Point group: C2
Chain length 186, copies 2
């Protein structure tokens, strides 16, 4: 089975955490929700408290992963951007030609860690200027953007599209379509 | 501020829990996530573990609520349907002419507790036959259905529509529109 690492920091957008985790699990992907700070519960942006499966340290030992997923939320993304452990994981994933997926403010951690320069990316509209500082990426307004192994998306309301794009990249279009149908998406 | 009670049982659909909680908090609603079983963490349908704000018992004491929200997930809804405490809360809410909102399999707990008979309702397609046993409701295929104080919806992919309908009912159309825009919904 494919494997996904979802890195969960304080201040993460909980919709952008839970929608990808759940949809990837519906696709039969083995997902590890890893707490940036440790195994303790994480207070998300709108105060939902989620208990991670593992600390990031332990989850790293259990790699490699077919995708590393970065939720958004301004403060969650700032915490991801400040983390040396996140830097190391993303560099490794990039070096092994593995998928990296980030949503809303999440892509700004790619900038912080110098990941995927020269890619077309999207972000939340409000995170554009941060992402574009230095002109290291080309901006897109697509709801989901995928430039090779860098997969980005815009906001809570693009989270299902984002998650299904991850499923398609890992498990193919037919599995994505089968996972999509019971969701009652428009 | 308006107040919402979200009742969280083992096996709840975590997307249908988190999307309404987060969107209602964006709308300035004071939301209490109450654990059916107690204050301990809840293992949702796709294994996301959420820590409730309170036990339901304590949250009841802190009522009344402007809305009671029932997430879906087959097993979560079964747990809600089996609960005498849920029965009592829903009967009280109905008696005081307060809104009740339920999504996916969640509406089947209205049937179990004899709430809102004679209403037009929707459910997940797979929960239709359970909901319709006895012909106590009239079925709808609308993505969100609202018949007075009974507000229902279909699935994970209708959760934003459902949550925004709750916000409109409580705080009005303008607040709903202002909350909606930053979400990047299609």
């Amino acid at each position: 089975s494919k494997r996904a690492l979802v890195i969960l920091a304080k201040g993460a957008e909980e919709m952008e955490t839970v929608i990808p985790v759940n949809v990837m699990r519906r696709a039969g992907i083995k997902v590890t929700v890893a707490g940036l700070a440790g195994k303790d519960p994480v207070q998300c942006s709108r105060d939902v408290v989620i208990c991670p499966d593992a600390s990031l340290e332990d989850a790293k030992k259990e790699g490699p992963y077919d995708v590393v997923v970065l939720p958004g939320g301004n403060l969650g993304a700032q915490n991801l951007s400040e983390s040396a452990a996140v830097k190391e994981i993303l560099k490794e994933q990039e070096n092994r030609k593995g998928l990296i997926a980030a949503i809303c403010a999440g892509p700004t951690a790619l900038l912080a860690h110098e990941i995927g320069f020269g890619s077309k990316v999207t972000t939340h509209p409000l995170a554009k200027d941060k992402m574009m500082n230095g002109g290291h990426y080309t901006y897109s307004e697509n709801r989901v953007e995928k430039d090779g192994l860098i997969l980005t998306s815009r906001g809570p309301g693009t989270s299902f599209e984002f998650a299904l794009a991850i499923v398609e990249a890992l498990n193919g279009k037919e599995v994505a379509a089968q996972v999509k149908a019971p969701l009652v998406l428009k």
